[PDB]
Amino acid sequence: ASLTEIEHLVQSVCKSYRETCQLRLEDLLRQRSNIFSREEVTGYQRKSMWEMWERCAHHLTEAIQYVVEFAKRLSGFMELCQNDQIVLLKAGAMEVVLVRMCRAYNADNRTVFFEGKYGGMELFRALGCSELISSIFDFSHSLSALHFSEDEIALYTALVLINAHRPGLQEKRKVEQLQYNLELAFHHHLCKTHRQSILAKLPPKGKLRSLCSQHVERLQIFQHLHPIVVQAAFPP
Amino acid sequence: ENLYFQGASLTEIEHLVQSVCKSYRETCQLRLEDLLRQRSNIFSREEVTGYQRKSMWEMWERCAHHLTEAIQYVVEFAKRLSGFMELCQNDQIVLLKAGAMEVVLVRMCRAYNADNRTVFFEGKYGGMELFRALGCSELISSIFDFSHSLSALHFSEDEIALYTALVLINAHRPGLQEKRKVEQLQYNLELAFHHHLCKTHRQSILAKLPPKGKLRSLCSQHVERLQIF
Amino acid sequence: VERLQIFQHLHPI
Ligand SMILES: O=C(Nc1ccc2c(c1)CN(S(=O)(=O)c1cccc(C(F)(F)F)c1)CCO2)c1c(F)cccc1Cl
Ligand SMILES: O=C(Nc1ccc2c(c1)CN(S(=O)(=O)c1cccc(C(F)(F)F)c1)CCO2)c1c(F)cccc1Cl
């Protein structure tokens, strides 16, 4: 890989992210002022855990669809066998959703963008998942301190997905090559933008993984009793 | 992994009928009563021209959206069938990859009016001329012909539920890992379907069902044109 | 239909 090929990979990953980010950073930032009132918060708190589950599972299904679209636009992902494509997305899509969340998170008031406005973790009281929600808000709080640029997120989330250590891969050597090219692209781009300092500040690989596992455990008890059919927007 | 992974008794077979019919009722997407009630709501000549003026790109997006949604409801129907979720993920993918579209094509006859040769599309009924921009005249015509031939059978909701359960639960799909479990599930559904046709004096529909390859050929012709778009 | 689309239909979450 030459300077030109690496740089093209950076630009491409960043374009694929821009096209699949779901919510524009400009829109999310200008809505930080639009905070849920005490009456609106109480309104969410009065809902059944079943009503909150369906609303949240709908938004989560939608977020996952955008992550899948991002993966499909990454060089070589499409060329991997269907098995390996499923293995990478089964293991990493949720983890990417957790990383993307920091964009919709305001660290000043500890609020998150949810259903048109910003609200604190108390909005989710009915779910009875206060420890898990708190961990989600803590993880988002820690990433927001890094002032992650859109391009840093694109490159970092591409590496969350393109991981050769996922159990069950049939073409491990192809994923390894794709991973290193993206690692080279990420490190090169950090050197061009004087952002070498973020690498040591990134959450340990195990942190996202455990949070994803804790999340999936809770999600399963909910979908076991309440499945839902949500509309899918895309592909080309 | 499930009671229907071995031969079921006739009492278990009647439970399987009721269950398949319930799963269908819960996942049919559009209620038969609503579809029959909207047969009067036909697209005007202005509305038809409006669809005809759209780009093939816009018609593709609208149609691919409606098809993705129809497939989701078929996937939901499969998941509610006894033993389907006890099959390995591989076999679940194989059955749905091979049969979901075919189920979609069968479910279409409910939204089809054989009197004026119209179909329910985006809130109203319209003829095949609505799809002109797609430049898929032969394929659309074949879809309307197949729906026309199925509508002649006057398929009841329960007959569709049982017939589409058998379209999906087919042990002959290449790539199955636990073929024997699919075979057991299939055998129980076949006896459930034949038994229910005997209870309702509807044994005559078996010989009227589309021949071997008809649904498959049409679904393959369909996936070829969708690849281009 | 394609294996990934099917998987995504089966496991939206
Ligand atoms: O909701 C759950 N998981 C979730 C995780 C990430 C997500 C989304 C959903 C989807 N949306 S969201 O619903 O607008 C939203 C927005 C912000 C914060 C949350 C918060 F805190 F609840 F996770 C949700 C975008 C963010 O990506 C959840 C849970 F945590 C526990 C049990 C059951 C469930 Cl369903
Ligand atoms: O449209 C295509 N495929 C399709 C097939 C079955 C479907 C649906 C879509 C989804 N909807 S629908 O779009 O409202 C509808 C309703 C009635 C008739 C049609 C007709 F004739 F177009 F097939 C569509 C329910 C019926 O199940 C199609 C094509 F034929 C050729 C090229 C590209 C494409 Cl996307």
Coordinates of C-alpha atoms and ligand atoms in Angstrom, one line a residue:
Chain A
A1 CA 0.0 0.0 0.0
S2 CA 1.3 3.4 -1.2
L3 CA 0.5 6.9 0.2
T4 CA -2.2 7.3 -2.5
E5 CA -3.9 3.9 -1.8
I6 CA -4.0 4.6 2.0
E7 CA -5.3 8.1 1.5
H8 CA -8.0 6.9 -0.8
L9 CA -9.0 4.3 1.9
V10 CA -9.3 7.1 4.5
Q11 CA -11.4 9.3 2.2
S12 CA -13.7 6.4 1.2
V13 CA -14.3 5.2 4.9
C14 CA -15.1 8.8 5.8
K15 CA -17.4 9.2 2.9
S16 CA -19.2 5.8 3.7
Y17 CA -19.6 7.1 7.3
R18 CA -21.0 10.5 6.2
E19 CA -23.6 8.7 4.0
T20 CA -24.7 6.3 6.7
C21 CA -24.3 8.3 10.0
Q22 CA -28.2 8.5 10.3
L23 CA -28.2 11.8 12.2
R24 CA -26.0 14.8 11.0
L25 CA -23.7 16.2 13.5
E26 CA -24.9 19.8 12.6
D27 CA -28.5 18.8 13.5
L28 CA -27.5 17.0 16.7
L29 CA -25.4 20.0 17.9
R30 CA -28.0 22.6 17.1
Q31 CA -30.7 20.6 19.0
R32 CA -28.6 20.4 22.3
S33 CA -30.8 23.5 23.4
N34 CA -34.0 21.5 22.9
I35 CA -34.2 19.7 26.3
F36 CA -37.3 17.6 27.5
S37 CA -39.4 19.4 30.2
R38 CA -40.1 17.9 33.6
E39 CA -43.6 17.1 32.4
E40 CA -42.2 15.3 29.3
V41 CA -39.7 13.3 31.5
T42 CA -42.6 12.2 33.8
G43 CA -44.6 11.3 30.7
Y44 CA -41.8 8.8 29.7
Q45 CA -41.5 7.6 33.3
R46 CA -45.2 6.7 33.4
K47 CA -45.0 4.5 30.3
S48 CA -44.9 0.7 30.7
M49 CA -41.5 -1.0 30.4
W50 CA -43.3 -2.6 27.4
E51 CA -44.0 0.8 25.7
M52 CA -40.4 1.9 26.4
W53 CA -39.0 -1.4 25.1
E54 CA -40.9 -1.1 21.8
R55 CA -39.9 2.6 21.2
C56 CA -36.2 1.7 22.1
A57 CA -36.1 -1.6 20.2
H58 CA -37.5 0.4 17.1
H59 CA -34.7 3.1 17.3
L60 CA -32.1 0.3 18.0
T61 CA -33.2 -1.7 14.9
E62 CA -33.0 1.5 12.8
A63 CA -29.4 2.3 14.2
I64 CA -28.3 -1.2 13.4
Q65 CA -29.6 -0.9 9.8
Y66 CA -27.4 2.2 9.3
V67 CA -24.3 0.3 10.7
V68 CA -25.0 -2.6 8.3
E69 CA -25.1 -0.1 5.4
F70 CA -21.8 1.4 6.6
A71 CA -20.2 -2.1 6.6
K72 CA -21.4 -2.8 3.1
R73 CA -19.7 0.4 1.8
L74 CA -16.3 -0.6 3.2
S75 CA -13.7 -1.9 0.7
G76 CA -13.5 -5.7 0.7
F77 CA -16.4 -6.2 3.1
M78 CA -18.7 -7.1 0.2
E79 CA -16.0 -9.5 -1.2
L80 CA -15.9 -11.5 2.0
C81 CA -18.1 -14.7 2.1
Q82 CA -21.7 -14.2 3.5
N83 CA -20.6 -16.2 6.6
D84 CA -17.8 -13.8 7.5
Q85 CA -20.0 -10.8 6.7
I86 CA -22.6 -12.2 9.2
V87 CA -19.9 -13.1 11.8
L88 CA -18.4 -9.5 11.7
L89 CA -21.8 -7.7 11.9
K90 CA -23.2 -10.1 14.6
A91 CA -20.2 -9.5 16.8
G92 CA -19.7 -5.7 16.0
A93 CA -22.8 -3.9 14.8
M94 CA -24.1 -3.2 18.4
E95 CA -20.6 -2.1 19.5
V96 CA -20.6 0.4 16.6
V97 CA -24.1 1.7 17.7
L98 CA -22.6 2.3 21.2
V99 CA -19.7 4.2 19.7
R100 CA -21.9 6.3 17.4
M101 CA -24.1 7.3 20.4
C102 CA -21.4 9.8 21.7
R103 CA -22.4 12.1 18.8
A104 CA -25.9 12.4 20.2
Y105 CA -24.6 12.8 23.7
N106 CA -24.1 16.2 25.5
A107 CA -21.4 15.9 28.3
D108 CA -22.3 19.4 29.8
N109 CA -25.8 18.3 31.1
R110 CA -25.3 14.5 30.7
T111 CA -28.2 14.3 28.2
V112 CA -28.8 12.2 25.1
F113 CA -30.8 12.8 21.9
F114 CA -33.9 10.7 22.1
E115 CA -37.2 11.0 20.1
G116 CA -36.6 14.6 19.0
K117 CA -35.2 16.1 22.1
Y118 CA -32.4 15.8 24.7
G119 CA -32.9 14.0 28.0
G120 CA -31.0 12.5 30.9
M121 CA -30.9 8.8 31.9
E122 CA -34.0 9.3 34.2
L123 CA -36.1 9.3 30.9
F124 CA -35.5 5.5 30.8
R125 CA -36.7 4.7 34.4
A126 CA -39.6 2.4 33.3
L127 CA -37.1 0.0 31.6
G128 CA -35.7 -1.0 35.1
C129 CA -32.2 -1.1 33.5
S130 CA -30.7 1.8 35.6
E131 CA -27.2 0.1 36.0
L132 CA -27.0 -0.7 32.2
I133 CA -28.3 2.8 31.2
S134 CA -25.8 4.4 33.6
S135 CA -22.9 2.4 32.0
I136 CA -24.1 3.5 28.5
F137 CA -24.1 7.2 29.6
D138 CA -20.6 6.7 31.3
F139 CA -19.1 5.2 28.1
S140 CA -20.6 8.0 26.0
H141 CA -19.3 10.5 28.6
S142 CA -15.7 9.1 28.3
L143 CA -15.7 9.2 24.5
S144 CA -17.1 12.8 24.3
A145 CA -14.1 14.0 26.4
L146 CA -11.8 12.9 23.4
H147 CA -13.7 15.4 21.1
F148 CA -13.8 12.6 18.5
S149 CA -14.1 14.1 15.0
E150 CA -16.5 12.5 12.4
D151 CA -13.5 11.1 10.5
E152 CA -12.0 9.6 13.7
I153 CA -15.4 7.8 14.5
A154 CA -15.6 6.5 10.8
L155 CA -12.1 5.1 11.0
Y156 CA -12.4 3.8 14.6
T157 CA -15.9 2.1 13.9
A158 CA -14.6 0.6 10.7
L159 CA -11.9 -1.1 12.9
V160 CA -14.6 -2.2 15.5
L161 CA -16.2 -4.2 12.6
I162 CA -13.1 -5.3 10.7
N163 CA -11.6 -7.5 13.4
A164 CA -9.9 -10.8 12.5
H165 CA -10.3 -12.2 16.1
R166 CA -14.1 -12.8 15.8
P167 CA -14.7 -16.6 16.4
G168 CA -16.2 -18.4 13.4
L169 CA -14.4 -16.7 10.5
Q170 CA -13.7 -18.9 7.4
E171 CA -11.4 -16.4 5.6
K172 CA -9.3 -15.1 8.6
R173 CA -6.3 -14.1 6.4
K174 CA -8.6 -11.8 4.2
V175 CA -10.1 -10.1 7.3
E176 CA -6.5 -9.7 8.8
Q177 CA -5.3 -7.9 5.6
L178 CA -8.4 -5.7 5.5
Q179 CA -7.9 -4.9 9.3
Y180 CA -4.2 -3.9 8.8
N181 CA -5.1 -1.7 5.8
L182 CA -7.7 0.2 7.9
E183 CA -5.2 0.3 10.9
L184 CA -2.6 1.9 8.6
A185 CA -5.3 4.3 7.2
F186 CA -6.4 5.3 10.8
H187 CA -2.7 5.8 12.1
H188 CA -1.8 7.7 8.9
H189 CA -4.8 10.0 9.2
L190 CA -4.1 10.6 13.0
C191 CA -0.5 11.7 11.9
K192 CA -1.9 14.1 9.2
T193 CA -4.3 15.7 11.6
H194 CA -1.8 15.8 14.6
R195 CA -4.1 13.5 16.5
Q196 CA -1.7 10.7 17.5
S197 CA -2.6 11.4 21.2
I198 CA -6.1 9.8 20.9
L199 CA -4.8 6.2 20.4
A200 CA -3.8 5.9 24.1
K201 CA -7.1 7.6 25.2
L202 CA -9.4 5.1 23.3
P203 CA -11.4 2.7 25.5
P204 CA -9.7 -0.8 25.9
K205 CA -11.1 -3.3 23.2
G206 CA -12.7 -5.3 26.1
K207 CA -14.7 -2.3 27.5
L208 CA -17.0 -2.0 24.4
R209 CA -17.3 -5.9 24.2
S210 CA -18.5 -6.3 27.9
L211 CA -20.9 -3.4 27.6
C212 CA -22.3 -5.0 24.4
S213 CA -22.7 -8.3 26.2
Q214 CA -24.4 -6.7 29.2
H215 CA -26.8 -4.9 26.7
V216 CA -27.6 -8.1 24.7
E217 CA -28.4 -10.0 28.0
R218 CA -31.1 -7.3 28.9
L219 CA -32.4 -7.0 25.3
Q220 CA -33.1 -10.8 25.2
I221 CA -35.4 -10.8 28.3
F222 CA -37.5 -8.0 26.5
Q223 CA -37.7 -9.5 22.9
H224 CA -38.6 -12.9 24.4
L225 CA -42.0 -11.5 25.4
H226 CA -42.5 -8.6 23.0
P227 CA -41.3 -8.9 19.3
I228 CA -41.9 -6.0 16.8
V229 CA -41.9 -5.4 13.0
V230 CA -40.1 -2.1 12.1
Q231 CA -39.9 -0.6 8.6
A232 CA -36.4 -0.7 6.9
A233 CA -35.1 2.3 4.8
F234 CA -32.3 1.6 2.2
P235 CA -30.5 0.0 0.0
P236 CA -29.4 1.7 -3.3
Chain B
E1 CA -35.2 -29.6 20.0
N2 CA -39.1 -29.5 19.4
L3 CA -42.1 -32.0 19.5
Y4 CA -42.5 -31.5 15.7
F5 CA -38.9 -32.8 15.1
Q6 CA -40.4 -36.2 15.4
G7 CA -43.8 -37.5 14.2
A8 CA -46.8 -35.8 15.9
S9 CA -50.1 -37.6 16.9
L10 CA -53.4 -36.3 15.3
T11 CA -54.2 -34.2 18.4
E12 CA -50.8 -32.5 18.1
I13 CA -51.5 -32.1 14.3
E14 CA -54.8 -30.2 15.0
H15 CA -52.8 -27.9 17.4
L16 CA -50.3 -27.3 14.6
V17 CA -53.2 -26.3 12.3
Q18 CA -54.6 -23.8 14.8
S19 CA -51.1 -22.4 15.6
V20 CA -50.1 -22.0 11.9
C21 CA -53.4 -20.2 11.2
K22 CA -52.9 -17.9 14.3
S23 CA -49.3 -17.1 13.2
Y24 CA -50.6 -16.2 9.7
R25 CA -53.4 -14.0 11.1
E26 CA -50.8 -12.1 13.3
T27 CA -48.3 -11.6 10.4
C28 CA -50.5 -11.2 7.2
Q29 CA -49.6 -7.4 7.1
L30 CA -52.9 -6.4 5.4
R31 CA -56.3 -7.7 6.8
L32 CA -58.4 -9.5 4.2
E33 CA -61.5 -7.5 5.2
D34 CA -59.6 -4.2 4.6
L35 CA -58.2 -5.4 1.2
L36 CA -61.8 -6.4 0.1
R37 CA -63.3 -3.1 1.4
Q38 CA -60.7 -1.1 -0.6
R39 CA -61.5 -2.8 -4.0
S40 CA -63.7 0.3 -4.8
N41 CA -60.8 2.7 -4.1
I42 CA -59.2 2.6 -7.7
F43 CA -56.3 5.0 -8.9
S44 CA -57.6 7.8 -11.2
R45 CA -56.2 8.2 -14.8
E46 CA -54.3 11.3 -13.4
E47 CA -52.8 9.2 -10.5
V48 CA -51.7 6.4 -13.0
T49 CA -50.0 9.1 -15.3
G50 CA -48.4 10.4 -12.1
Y51 CA -46.8 7.0 -11.4
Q52 CA -45.9 6.6 -15.1
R53 CA -43.9 9.9 -15.1
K54 CA -41.7 8.9 -12.2
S55 CA -38.2 7.7 -12.9
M56 CA -37.5 3.9 -12.9
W57 CA -35.2 4.9 -9.9
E58 CA -38.1 6.3 -7.9
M59 CA -40.4 3.3 -8.8
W60 CA -37.6 0.9 -7.9
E61 CA -37.1 2.6 -4.4
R62 CA -40.9 2.6 -3.7
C63 CA -41.3 -1.1 -4.8
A64 CA -38.0 -2.3 -3.1
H65 CA -39.3 -0.6 0.1
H66 CA -42.7 -2.4 -0.1
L67 CA -41.0 -5.7 -1.0
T68 CA -38.5 -5.4 2.0
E69 CA -41.5 -4.8 4.3
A70 CA -43.5 -7.8 2.8
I71 CA -40.4 -10.0 3.4
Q72 CA -40.1 -8.9 7.0
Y73 CA -43.7 -10.1 7.6
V74 CA -42.9 -13.5 6.0
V75 CA -39.8 -13.7 8.3
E76 CA -42.1 -13.0 11.3
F77 CA -44.5 -15.7 10.1
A78 CA -41.6 -18.3 9.8
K79 CA -40.3 -17.4 13.3
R80 CA -43.8 -18.1 14.8
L81 CA -43.9 -21.7 13.2
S82 CA -43.3 -24.6 15.7
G83 CA -39.7 -25.8 15.5
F84 CA -38.5 -23.1 13.1
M85 CA -36.6 -21.2 15.8
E86 CA -35.2 -24.5 17.1
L87 CA -33.5 -25.1 13.7
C88 CA -29.9 -23.9 13.5
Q89 CA -29.4 -20.3 12.2
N90 CA -27.9 -21.7 8.9
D91 CA -31.1 -23.8 8.1
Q92 CA -33.3 -20.8 9.1
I93 CA -31.4 -18.6 6.6
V94 CA -31.5 -21.4 3.9
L95 CA -35.3 -21.8 4.2
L96 CA -36.0 -18.0 4.2
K97 CA -33.5 -17.2 1.4
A98 CA -35.1 -19.9 -0.8
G99 CA -38.7 -19.3 0.1
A100 CA -39.6 -15.8 1.5
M101 CA -40.1 -14.2 -2.0
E102 CA -42.2 -17.2 -3.1
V103 CA -44.4 -16.6 0.0
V104 CA -44.6 -12.9 -0.9
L105 CA -45.8 -13.9 -4.4
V106 CA -48.5 -16.2 -2.9
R107 CA -49.7 -13.6 -0.3
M108 CA -50.1 -11.1 -3.2
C109 CA -53.3 -12.8 -4.5
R110 CA -55.2 -11.5 -1.4
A111 CA -54.4 -7.9 -2.5
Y112 CA -55.4 -8.7 -6.1
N113 CA -58.9 -8.1 -7.7
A114 CA -59.5 -10.5 -10.6
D115 CA -62.6 -8.6 -11.9
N116 CA -60.6 -5.5 -13.1
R117 CA -57.1 -7.1 -12.9
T118 CA -55.9 -4.5 -10.3
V119 CA -53.6 -4.8 -7.3
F120 CA -53.4 -2.9 -4.0
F121 CA -50.4 -0.6 -4.2
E122 CA -49.6 2.4 -2.0
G123 CA -53.2 2.8 -0.6
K124 CA -55.3 2.2 -3.7
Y125 CA -56.0 -0.4 -6.5
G126 CA -54.2 -0.1 -9.9
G127 CA -53.5 -2.2 -13.0
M128 CA -50.1 -3.2 -14.2
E129 CA -49.8 0.1 -16.3
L130 CA -48.9 1.8 -12.9
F131 CA -45.5 0.1 -13.1
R132 CA -44.6 1.3 -16.7
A133 CA -41.5 3.2 -15.6
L134 CA -39.8 0.0 -14.3
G135 CA -39.4 -1.3 -17.9
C136 CA -40.2 -4.8 -16.5
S137 CA -43.4 -5.4 -18.6
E138 CA -42.9 -9.2 -19.0
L139 CA -42.2 -9.8 -15.3
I140 CA -45.1 -7.6 -14.1
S141 CA -47.5 -9.3 -16.5
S142 CA -46.3 -12.8 -15.2
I143 CA -46.8 -11.6 -11.6
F144 CA -50.4 -10.4 -12.4
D145 CA -51.1 -13.7 -14.3
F146 CA -49.9 -15.9 -11.4
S147 CA -52.1 -13.8 -8.9
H148 CA -55.0 -14.1 -11.4
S149 CA -54.6 -17.9 -11.4
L150 CA -54.4 -18.2 -7.6
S151 CA -57.4 -15.9 -7.0
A152 CA -59.5 -18.4 -9.0
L153 CA -58.9 -21.0 -6.2
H154 CA -60.8 -18.7 -3.6
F155 CA -58.0 -19.6 -1.1
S156 CA -59.2 -19.1 2.5
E157 CA -56.9 -17.4 5.0
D158 CA -56.2 -20.8 6.7
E159 CA -55.5 -22.5 3.3
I160 CA -52.9 -19.7 2.6
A161 CA -51.3 -20.0 6.1
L162 CA -50.9 -23.8 5.6
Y163 CA -49.8 -23.6 2.0
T164 CA -47.2 -20.8 2.7
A165 CA -45.9 -22.7 5.8
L166 CA -45.2 -25.6 3.3
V167 CA -43.6 -23.2 0.8
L168 CA -41.1 -22.4 3.5
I169 CA -40.7 -25.7 5.3
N170 CA -39.1 -27.7 2.4
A171 CA -36.4 -30.3 3.2
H172 CA -35.2 -30.2 -0.5
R173 CA -33.5 -26.7 -0.2
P174 CA -29.8 -27.1 -1.0
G175 CA -27.5 -26.3 1.9
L176 CA -29.4 -27.6 4.9
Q177 CA -27.3 -29.0 7.8
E178 CA -30.2 -30.6 9.8
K179 CA -32.3 -31.9 6.8
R180 CA -33.9 -34.6 9.0
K181 CA -35.4 -32.0 11.4
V182 CA -36.8 -30.0 8.4
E183 CA -38.2 -33.3 7.0
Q184 CA -40.0 -34.1 10.3
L185 CA -41.4 -30.5 10.5
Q186 CA -42.5 -30.7 6.8
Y187 CA -44.2 -34.1 7.2
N188 CA -46.2 -32.8 10.1
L189 CA -47.3 -29.7 8.2
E190 CA -48.3 -31.8 5.1
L191 CA -50.5 -34.0 7.2
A192 CA -51.8 -30.8 9.0
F193 CA -52.7 -29.3 5.6
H194 CA -54.3 -32.5 4.2
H195 CA -56.2 -33.2 7.4
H196 CA -57.6 -29.6 7.5
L197 CA -58.6 -29.8 3.8
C198 CA -60.6 -33.0 4.7
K199 CA -62.3 -31.3 7.7
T200 CA -63.4 -28.4 5.5
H201 CA -64.3 -30.5 2.3
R202 CA -61.6 -28.6 0.4
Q203 CA -59.6 -31.7 -0.9
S204 CA -60.2 -30.3 -4.5
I205 CA -57.7 -27.4 -4.0
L206 CA -54.6 -29.8 -4.0
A207 CA -54.9 -30.5 -7.7
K208 CA -55.5 -26.8 -8.4
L209 CA -52.2 -25.7 -6.6
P210 CA -49.4 -24.2 -8.8
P211 CA -47.2 -26.9 -10.4
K212 CA -43.6 -27.9 -9.4
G213 CA -41.2 -25.0 -10.4
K214 CA -43.9 -22.3 -11.1
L215 CA -43.3 -20.2 -7.9
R216 CA -39.5 -20.9 -8.1
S217 CA -39.1 -19.8 -11.8
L218 CA -41.1 -16.5 -11.1
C219 CA -39.0 -15.8 -8.0
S220 CA -35.7 -16.3 -10.0
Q221 CA -37.0 -14.1 -12.9
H222 CA -37.8 -11.5 -10.1
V223 CA -34.4 -11.6 -8.3
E224 CA -32.6 -11.2 -11.7
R225 CA -34.4 -7.9 -12.4
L226 CA -33.9 -6.7 -8.8
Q227 CA -30.1 -7.3 -9.1
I228 CA -29.9 -4.7 -11.9
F229 CA -31.8 -2.2 -9.7
Chain C
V1 CA -33.0 -12.8 -1.5
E2 CA -29.3 -12.9 -0.1
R3 CA -28.1 -14.5 3.2
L4 CA -27.2 -11.1 5.0
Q5 CA -30.7 -9.6 4.2
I6 CA -32.3 -12.8 5.6
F7 CA -30.0 -12.8 8.7
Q8 CA -30.9 -9.0 9.3
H9 CA -34.7 -9.9 8.9
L10 CA -34.3 -12.8 11.5
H11 CA -32.1 -10.7 13.9
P12 CA -32.9 -7.0 13.6
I13 CA -31.3 -6.8 17.1
Ligands
LIG1 O1 -32.8 1.4 24.5 C1 -32.0 0.5 24.7 N1 -30.8 0.2 24.0 C2 -30.3 1.1 23.0 C3 -28.9 1.3 23.0 C4 -28.4 2.2 22.0 C5 -29.2 2.8 21.1 C6 -30.6 2.5 21.1 C7 -31.1 1.7 22.1 C8 -31.5 3.2 20.1 N2 -31.7 4.6 20.0 S1 -32.7 5.3 21.3 O2 -33.6 4.3 21.7 O3 -33.1 6.6 20.8 C9 -31.6 5.6 22.7 C10 -30.9 6.8 22.7 C11 -30.1 7.1 23.7 C12 -30.0 6.2 24.8 C13 -30.7 5.0 24.8 C14 -30.5 4.1 26.0 F1 -29.9 4.8 27.0 F2 -31.6 3.6 26.5 F3 -29.7 3.1 25.7 C15 -31.5 4.7 23.7 C16 -30.4 5.2 19.6 C17 -29.1 4.9 20.4 O4 -28.7 3.6 20.1 C18 -32.3 -0.5 25.7 C19 -31.6 -0.6 26.9 F4 -30.5 0.2 27.0 C20 -31.9 -1.5 27.8 C21 -32.9 -2.4 27.7 C22 -33.7 -2.3 26.6 C23 -33.4 -1.4 25.6 CL1 -34.3 -1.4 24.2
LIG2 O1 -42.3 -4.3 -7.4 C1 -41.5 -5.2 -7.6 N1 -41.5 -6.4 -6.9 C2 -42.5 -6.8 -5.9 C3 -43.1 -8.0 -6.0 C4 -44.0 -8.4 -5.1 C5 -44.4 -7.5 -4.1 C6 -43.7 -6.2 -4.0 C7 -42.8 -5.9 -4.9 C8 -44.0 -5.3 -2.9 N2 -45.4 -4.7 -2.7 S1 -45.7 -3.5 -3.9 O2 -44.5 -2.9 -4.4 O3 -46.8 -2.7 -3.3 C9 -46.4 -4.2 -5.4 C10 -47.8 -4.5 -5.4 C11 -48.3 -5.1 -6.5 C12 -47.5 -5.4 -7.6 C13 -46.2 -5.1 -7.6 C14 -45.4 -5.4 -8.7 F1 -46.2 -5.7 -9.8 F2 -44.4 -4.5 -9.1 F3 -44.6 -6.6 -8.6 C15 -45.6 -4.5 -6.4 C16 -46.3 -5.8 -2.3 C17 -46.4 -7.0 -3.2 O4 -45.3 -7.9 -3.1 C18 -40.5 -5.1 -8.6 C19 -40.7 -5.7 -9.9 F4 -41.9 -6.4 -10.1 C20 -39.8 -5.5 -10.9 C21 -38.7 -4.8 -10.7 C22 -38.4 -4.2 -9.4 C23 -39.4 -4.4 -8.4 CL1 -39.0 -3.7 -6.9

